[PDB]
Design a protein around this ligand. Sequence first.
Ligand SMILES: *[C@@H]1O[C@H](CO)[C@@H](O[C@@H]2O[C@H](CO)[C@@H](O)[C@H](O)[C@H]2NC(C)=O)[C@H](O)[C@H]1NC(C)=O
Ligand SMILES: *[C@@H]1O[C@H](CO)[C@@H](O[C@@H]2O[C@H](CO)[C@@H](O)[C@H](O)[C@H]2NC(C)=O)[C@H](O)[C@H]1NC(C)=O
Ligand SMILES: *[C@@H]1O[C@H](CO)[C@@H](O[C@@H]2O[C@H](CO)[C@@H](O)[C@H](O)[C@H]2NC(C)=O)[C@H](O)[C@H]1NC(C)=O
Ligand SMILES: *[C@@H]1O[C@H](CO)[C@@H](O[C@@H]2O[C@H](CO)[C@@H](O)[C@H](O)[C@H]2NC(C)=O)[C@H](O)[C@H]1NC(C)=O
Ligand SMILES: *[C@@H]1O[C@H](CO)[C@@H](O[C@@H]2O[C@H](CO)[C@@H](O)[C@H](O)[C@H]2NC(C)=O)[C@H](O)[C@H]1NC(C)=O
Ligand SMILES: *[C@@H]1O[C@H](CO)[C@@H](O[C@@H]2O[C@H](CO)[C@@H](O)[C@H](O)[C@H]2NC(C)=O)[C@H](O)[C@H]1NC(C)=O
Ligand SMILES: *[C@@H]1O[C@H](CO)[C@@H](O)[C@H](O)[C@H]1NC(C)=O
Ligand SMILES: *[C@@H]1O[C@H](CO)[C@@H](O)[C@H](O)[C@H]1NC(C)=O
Ligand SMILES: *[C@@H]1O[C@H](CO)[C@@H](O)[C@H](O)[C@H]1NC(C)=O
Ligand SMILES: *[C@@H]1O[C@H](CO)[C@@H](O)[C@H](O)[C@H]1NC(C)=O
Ligand SMILES: *[C@@H]1O[C@H](CO)[C@@H](O)[C@H](O)[C@H]1NC(C)=O
Lengths: 459, 201, 84
Amino acid sequence: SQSIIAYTMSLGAENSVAYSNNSIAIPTNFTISVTTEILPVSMTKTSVDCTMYICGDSTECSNLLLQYGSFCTQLNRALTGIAVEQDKNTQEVFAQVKQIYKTPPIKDFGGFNFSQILPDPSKPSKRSFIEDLLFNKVTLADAGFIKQYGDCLGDIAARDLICAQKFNGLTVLPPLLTDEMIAQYTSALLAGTITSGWTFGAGAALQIPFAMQMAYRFNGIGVTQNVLYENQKLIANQFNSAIGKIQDSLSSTASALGKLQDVVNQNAQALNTLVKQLSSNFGAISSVLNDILSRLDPPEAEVQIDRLITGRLQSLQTYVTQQLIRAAEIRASANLAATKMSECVLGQSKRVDFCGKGYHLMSFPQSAPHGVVFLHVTYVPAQEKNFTTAPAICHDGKAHFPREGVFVSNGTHWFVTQRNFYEPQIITTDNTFVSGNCDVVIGIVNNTVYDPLQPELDS
Amino acid sequence: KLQDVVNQNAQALNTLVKQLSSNFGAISSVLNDILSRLDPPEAEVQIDRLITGRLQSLQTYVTQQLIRAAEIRASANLAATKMSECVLGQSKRVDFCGKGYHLMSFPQSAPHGVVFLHVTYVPAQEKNFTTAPAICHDGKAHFPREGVFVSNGTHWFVTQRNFYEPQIITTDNTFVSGNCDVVIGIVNNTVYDPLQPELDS
Amino acid sequence: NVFQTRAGCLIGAEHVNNSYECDIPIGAGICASYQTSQSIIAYTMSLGAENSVAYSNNSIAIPTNFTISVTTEILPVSMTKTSV
Ligand SMILES: *[C@@H]1O[C@H](CO)[C@@H](O[C@@H]2O[C@H](CO)[C@@H](O)[C@H](O)[C@H]2NC(C)=O)[C@H](O)[C@H]1NC(C)=O
Ligand SMILES: *[C@@H]1O[C@H](CO)[C@@H](O[C@@H]2O[C@H](CO)[C@@H](O)[C@H](O)[C@H]2NC(C)=O)[C@H](O)[C@H]1NC(C)=O
Ligand SMILES: *[C@@H]1O[C@H](CO)[C@@H](O[C@@H]2O[C@H](CO)[C@@H](O)[C@H](O)[C@H]2NC(C)=O)[C@H](O)[C@H]1NC(C)=O
Ligand SMILES: *[C@@H]1O[C@H](CO)[C@@H](O[C@@H]2O[C@H](CO)[C@@H](O)[C@H](O)[C@H]2NC(C)=O)[C@H](O)[C@H]1NC(C)=O
Ligand SMILES: *[C@@H]1O[C@H](CO)[C@@H](O[C@@H]2O[C@H](CO)[C@@H](O)[C@H](O)[C@H]2NC(C)=O)[C@H](O)[C@H]1NC(C)=O
Ligand SMILES: *[C@@H]1O[C@H](CO)[C@@H](O[C@@H]2O[C@H](CO)[C@@H](O)[C@H](O)[C@H]2NC(C)=O)[C@H](O)[C@H]1NC(C)=O
Ligand SMILES: *[C@@H]1O[C@H](CO)[C@@H](O)[C@H](O)[C@H]1NC(C)=O
Ligand SMILES: *[C@@H]1O[C@H](CO)[C@@H](O)[C@H](O)[C@H]1NC(C)=O
Ligand SMILES: *[C@@H]1O[C@H](CO)[C@@H](O)[C@H](O)[C@H]1NC(C)=O
Ligand SMILES: *[C@@H]1O[C@H](CO)[C@@H](O)[C@H](O)[C@H]1NC(C)=O
Ligand SMILES: *[C@@H]1O[C@H](CO)[C@@H](O)[C@H](O)[C@H]1NC(C)=O
């Protein structure tokens, strides 16, 4: 009884924010959420042989293609320009630092578990458990870029894509940086983020306790660092559970990496299509170059072969154009990944939703096939409560404004607390500064401002 | 990087001139050789092969330029962003102006581009310092308003993170939050009170 | 002088254990250079000098001195305007 249904697309659950001049909502509790953002860095490096692709194993045809001249050279000049920048895209993202950092053998992070994001020497290539998942959820070509001629010759796999591309002159150039090395760049960038904080991107790596690192990344998002060490046991548990949810997200759902799988698919589809382009007749009597040479004289073959050359060359010009446009898209995502490597992983991004939803703390790079996966640690307010608020306070007749934080009331007494976490404090002259009077500020209320020096005068 | 902009633009124009020596399947690449030999009926067959190739050559060049212009525009939008956020302002973005904490940037005109001179704050000489998250004076945890807690092996000092300027730990430097039964790694240290000597008078 | 790399069989380059900065990029983590009796050498690309950060709960490194570094970043703005 299942059928196709047609519905108006929902915009999401509608939420009505209750708004009033005297109301504010401050989170009393929060959650540490690790969000997975996945960006393509590099794309498949392809070197096409345009003498081989157009004229297969043919002297008569190749002599005709040489009349076309620079066409074969200018296509490879653009494909090489891609192959160079794809190694440059990977160079700009994964290596921002000259030094390779490693975590010390003794691990005390303050409860934070990083064994999932840290490399595992047990594997043949040193990689994190997540980078092992990232490599297993993206299907690539055969292991290694060396495919023997006898492997294709001795056994012909029925409809084998990679051999057929190579016998047509389509070669996949290996990236300059192996996945084993990329895992060691992400390891160096992660080991510096863990041990040295954000200081390793602006200079020499300066070790700081990861607790103090968390404390000073709360000062960046506007949360007083005292919130950390009170919740440190919880913040480490909320974080370690969030990393544990990255496993269940990657392992169960294999479509999270589809952005990077699309990079492999489009590169394979474009090469596979380029092989299918050879079955087109181009207006010639046959698409086969050997059928024309075995039938028509060179005068009658040149007419037919030049139709094949023009089409097979335009097919390469189409492919190279598809690659240059796609390489500009991958480079834009690589420049974005290189920006999210610097400003997000290496530093702490003040940019809202640049590292994803929530106030960002630090990001963890993870090597993925033809790309990078940033694990973004974000500060998300969890439990909130409405609180009667006021812009200022009238004590002696002078308006008091918070140096940091807001004025809130629980219905009886007015308290001062920071915006992004609820930590009610007695309103004092150290918390609030004196500006102007009470005849101006709109919504101002009357409240006693405690003076820490007042009890000292009682003695 | 800017020489490549001049080279690729010159190479693409120079290649486009070399594109004219291609026969395109026609008997000759020269347009005057065909007109001086074949009748218009036999020339149109040969010339249309040259036109189709020379036009596809321009369509190839224009495509190379549109793709390259989109790359230069992306670098120009990046340069216009580094002109505003870096030169005109002070970039909080890490390694957006280059390595080091950025102060100001100096634009310099270069051929077909711009050269930003980025003034960055780079920590030079560093020293290990025994640190603690908080301090126990009367039994209430003290946290720095700005900076860190450090020790030279005897006395605990408070100083900012990005430069070493040790200061006596005081109630003006540190704020009172919570107690000492929670914070992990907290130590015991006396927090000086600037008001305390005023009560001695 | 025949050597096997991860990118493929490499003939004419000598295998050198010393990992240096990448000079002529090859692929599959291999780079080449022309050095010393001078011949082409084939070496595994070095990732940079390995630095081990000493890390502990009770340790921090604060710079006592600093340097003002002016770095030169060079970006293309405009390209040659061509009217064909
Ligand atoms: C981080 O979490 C992992 C996974 O829970 C911990 O590794 C486990 O260690 C226990 C023994 O303590 C083993 O019984 C499990 O089989 C291990 N699991 C895996 C997948 O390796 C690791 O010890 C934790 N690290 C810290 C510092 O807490
Ligand atoms: C704030 O929320 C966190 C959960 O995000 C609470 O921590 C959980 O508390 C429940 C009930 O005690 C436990 O069963 C969970 O195991 C805790 N999880 C973690 C990560 O520790 C925390 O107690 C809440 N705090 C307040 C003050 O409400
Ligand atoms: C709102 O907060 C104020 C201040 O914490 C509460 O007033 C205090 O109530 C406790 C008893 O629960 C007394 O011991 C304190 O002495 C009171 N304040 C002072 C300064 O003496 C008030 O009860 C709270 N109201 C609500 C509805 O929670
Ligand atoms: C806060 O206190 C001020 C001062 O007592 C209040 O302003 C007075 O309001 C009354 C009654 O209308 C007048 O007779 C006075 O002339 C006002 N005095 C001043 C100094 O302005 C103000 O109304 C109080 N606000 C609240 C919300 O209690
Ligand atoms: C660490 O710093 C403290 C404080 O500066 C040093 O203690 C002082 O030592 C000087 C002599 O060098 C005395 O005149 C001061 O009176 C001491 N402090 C106070 C508050 O009296 C301590 O010697 C330093 N330790 C090291 C190893 O450098
Ligand atoms: C800092 O001072 C506190 C308080 O004197 C110390 O805590 C005491 O530890 C002793 C010895 O085990 C106990 O008998 C007390 O019950 C503790 N008192 C309190 C108030 O907790 C603490 O050990 C000191 N820390 C350091 C590093 O010296
Ligand atoms: C502000 O809030 C008060 C209640 O506290 C309400 O009576 C008033 O209408 C609101 N608007 C103005 C004008 O302040
Ligand atoms: C705050 O007021 C709004 C008014 O709609 C209400 O929905 C909300 O539940 C209140 N606060 C909480 C935390 O319930
Ligand atoms: C700090 O300790 C590390 C431990 O390896 C040491 O290498 C370093 O030299 C020490 N500090 C300085 C400035 O020497
Ligand atoms: C280089 O490494 C190989 C393999 O371990 C070894 O056989 C050779 O002796 C080494 N040469 C040098 C110069 O150490
Ligand atoms: C913290 O540092 C102390 C030395 O100051 C060390 O004994 C302890 O093992 C470290 N780890 C913990 C659990 O604090």
